């Protein structure tokens, strides 16, 4: 019965390909040609937070757009006040090999994770003043690559065991687990309505998930290498994917295909982080060539260079109000641009 | 500037504590464990005492070591191997009882992140290798080995095969043989680490 199953799979793939090809009546490049270009976007460094001593792997903003949390490899998660460039907290970590961080939307908890296969939840509003480890989630076989906060009780994580899981920070059990990727998952983006999320794995494929039913909805392809970043459009109807093939690609949830390829023949270093602007007009992508490019999301054109890092940029993120852009590189310095 | 002064004082205090912790941590010596499954990594990490990453620390002659074992990661190595760019050396262990490890050594030796870090080679199960040599020829693994069927020459050929994978002139590959019943592993690692430390410090100053 293996032959029948293989034939059915091939037929289904052909049907999906034909259906997706029929709906491509026009492209974004043929539609947004008559809009005036954004011109030059010359941003200058506003602050330079020099606290760490080793590589920086992650950086996340709070909901108030003033506080940021950096999880460096020195085994320290320092919470940052951007306006005054002050250190507000210093949380030592049990495992120094950390490669993700998350700031709760309420602002009471901070998540962390890495090669310990375990997601750690720290409580920033303890009665005793200091910060304590509220919970230590276990259940992943491979390394935890990302973690995002749905709310104060549920946290969704992506790990290198080819599976993503939904957690309950109260009982510390996997309420729902997501399967289907054939390889390591190294990115994750929760939707603005916190009902959907998408993951980009190392098998060169992006998938759309439903948090409630726990079933895969759509599969996006088009990359020739591992996907290192993912991020939603502000409207939640589209998302951007950066890969190790030096290309950023834009997909549509409803149209279920690709829309634009953000590539330059001169660029060869991979992308480590993709993030948008508040209006969804710019797409700041972090390359390994020690600089971050600002792409025009509607015309596939460069609009400026955020040069200034001595090493590869490992994390990028914009504030909720869109008043600042953050870049964190291996040079142990985090920068605020405006 | 009413209670922002106290915030500034707190930030300065915790910055000072960060600096002190960094200086305290910078003294330690960091090694990295690598090898095939059941190659003998567990034996030589347990003989020195004390599913994620397993870290083992011990002090030997005024040096604090930190052996980082990453054998539990059943995923792609290329997505986390850059975490150890600053390790002083790589301890690579080969089980002489058994070609499935030569490819791994070749991959790890020419890696862009490890173009300057030295590699320390330990070979285990000497008695087992001798028994197998008596029982079976050593040319089954290496068909091109035209030489005597003895332990002494087989070990030399194995060392040559593993050492020929180096391409960078600015690194060294120390070698050693083990019999699973000796305690000289600590002294060997100490001597190799002192040599590597001398080399790195001389190269930093430009005198190398």
């Amino acid at each position: 019965e293996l032959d029948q199953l293989r034939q059915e799979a091939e037929q289904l793939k052909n049907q999906i390909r034909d259906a997706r090809k029929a709906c491509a009546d026009a492209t974004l490049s043929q539609i947004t040609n008559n809009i005036d270009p954004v011109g030059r976007i010359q941003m200058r460094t506003r602050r330079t937070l020099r606290g760490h001593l080793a590589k920086i792997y992650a950086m996340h903003w709070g909901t108030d757009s003033r506080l940021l949390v950096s999880a460096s490899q020195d085994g320290k998660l320092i919470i940052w006040d951007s306006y005054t460039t002050n250190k507000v907290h210093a949380i030592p970590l049990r495992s120094s090999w950390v490669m993700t961080c998350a700031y709760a939307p309420s602002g009471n908890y901070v998540a962390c994770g890495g090669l310990d296969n375990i997601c750690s939840i720290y409580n920033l509003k303890t009665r005793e003043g200091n910060v304590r480890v509220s919970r230590e989630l276990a259940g992943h076989t491979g390394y935890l690559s990302c973690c995002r906060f749905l709310d104060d009780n549920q946290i969704v994580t992506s790990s290198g065991d080819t599976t993503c899981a939904l957690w309950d920070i109260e009982t510390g059990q996997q309420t729902t687990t997501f399967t289907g990727h054939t390889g390591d998952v190294m990115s994750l983006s929760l939707a603005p309505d916190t009902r959907l999320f998408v993951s980009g794995a190392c098998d060169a494929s992006a998938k759309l998930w439903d948090v409630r039913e726990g079933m895969c909805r759509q599969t996006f392809t088009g990359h020739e290498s591992d996907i290192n970043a993912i991020c939603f459009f502000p409207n939640g109807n589209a998302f951007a994917t950066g890969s190790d093939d030096a290309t950023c690609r834009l997909f549509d949830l409803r149209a279920d295909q690709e829309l634009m390829t953000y590539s330059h023949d001169n660029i060869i270093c991979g992308i480590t982080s993709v993030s948008f602007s508040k209006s969804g007009r710019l797409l700041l992508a972090g390359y390994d060539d020690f600089n971050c490019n600002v792409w025009d999301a509607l015309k596939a054109d460069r609009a400026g260079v955020l040069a200034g890092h001595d090493n590869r940029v490992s994390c990028l993120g914009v504030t909720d109000d869109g008043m600042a852009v953050a870049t964190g590189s291996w040079d142990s310095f985090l920068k605020i641009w405006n | 500037s009413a209670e922002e002064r106290a915030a500034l004082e707190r930030s300065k205090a915790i910055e000072k504590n960060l600096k002190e912790d960094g200086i305290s941590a910078a003294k330690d010596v960091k090694l990295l464990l690598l090898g095939a499954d059941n190659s003998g990594k567990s034996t030589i990490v347990k003989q020195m005492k004390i599913t994620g990453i397993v870290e083992t620390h011990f002090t030997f002659k005024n040096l604090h070591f930190r052996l980082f074992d990453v054998g539990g990661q059943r995923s792609e190595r290329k997505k986390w191997i850059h975490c150890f760019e600053d390790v002083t050396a790589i301890i690579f262990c080969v089980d002489l009882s058994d070609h499935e490890s030569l490819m791994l050594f070749d991959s790890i030796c020419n890696n862009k992140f490890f173009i300057d870090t030295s590699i320390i080679l330990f070979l285990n199960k000497k008695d087992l290798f001798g028994e197998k040599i008596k029982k079976s020829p050593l040319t089954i693994c290496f068909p091109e080995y035209t030489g005597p069927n003895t332990y002494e020459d087989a070990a030399a050929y194995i060392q040559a095969q593993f050492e020929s994978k180096n391409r960078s002139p600015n690194k060294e590959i120390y070698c050693h043989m083990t019999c699973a019943t000796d305690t000289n592993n600590a002294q060997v690692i100490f001597d190799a680490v002192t040599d590597i430390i001398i080399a790195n410090n001389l190269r930093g100053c430009g005198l190398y």
Epitope: R66, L67, D81, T84, N86, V88, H89, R127, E128, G129, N130 | S1, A2, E3, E4, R5, A6, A7, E9, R10, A13
Partner: single-chain antibody
């Protein structure tokens, strides 16, 4: 739980020397700024001394400076020299943390009793006493001699509640925010110079005396106090 028990009072001859010590347990005392607040047998609260975390900055009141010294094992010491007749009060222990979004003056100790045989922002609580019935909304007013809206946009008015026979509790900090555990019925407002704390759906446990404090610059001068007596 957090606990601040302290002792060192009694009856002292004038010119004698006493030592009050504050025992702390249940919280990271090494990272909190401890103050000293006293209450005369009839008058209101008056700030005494403050010692920063790490013994960096120490402040003393104008009527305290020179004679009294404070020092810090989880114990806070306050050396007391040249006791005068005006020093009779009940000395309290208060902790405080200062960072972005912090809640200063959150916890207050049980206090100890001691008996002895020009740029200050003066604050006035115009109403000495306010009679109010259960279930009816009231209002507590305060003022200041200088603007308390700093350039950074944070008003520094702290409201305190002193229940009858109990240590004061922090109810509203930064003139708009509500402290931890405080019921939602309380709400405070104001602008620039005049401030108001609105109590809606009065209950039996809210009866007491309410206080006004400033934090724009040392010394921290309190108000006279408004007595929200029953009926």
């Amino acid at each position: 739980d957090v606990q601040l028990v302290e002792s060192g009072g009694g009856l002292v001859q004038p010119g004698g020397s006493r030592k009050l010590s504050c025992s702390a347990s249940g919280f990271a005392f090494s990272s909190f700024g401890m103050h000293w607040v006293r209450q005369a047998p009839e008058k209101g609260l008056e700030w005494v001394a403050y010692i920063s975390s790490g013994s960096g900055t120490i402040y003393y009141a104008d009527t305290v400076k020179g004679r009294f010294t404070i020092s810090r094992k989880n114990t806070l010491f306050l050396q007391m020299t040249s006791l005068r007749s005006e020093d009779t009060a009940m000395y309290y222990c208060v902790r405080s943390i200062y960072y972005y979004g912090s809640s200063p003056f959150d916890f207050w100790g049980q206090g100890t009793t001691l008996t002895v045989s020009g740029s200050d922002i003066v604050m006035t609580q115009a109403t000495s006493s306010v009679p109010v019935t259960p279930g009816e909304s009231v209002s507590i007013s305060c003022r200041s001699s200088k603007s308390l809206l700093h350039s950074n946009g944070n008003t520094y008015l702290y409201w305190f509640l002193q229940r009858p026979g109990q240590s004061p509790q922090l109810l509203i900090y930064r003139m708009s925010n509500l402290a931890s555990g405080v019921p939602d019925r309380f709400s405070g407002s104001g602008s620039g110079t005049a401030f108001t704390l609105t109590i809606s759906r009065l209950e039996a446990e809210d009866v007491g005396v309410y206080y006004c404090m400033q934090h724009l610059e040392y010394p921290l001068t309190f108000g006279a106090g408004t007595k929200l007596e029953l009926k």
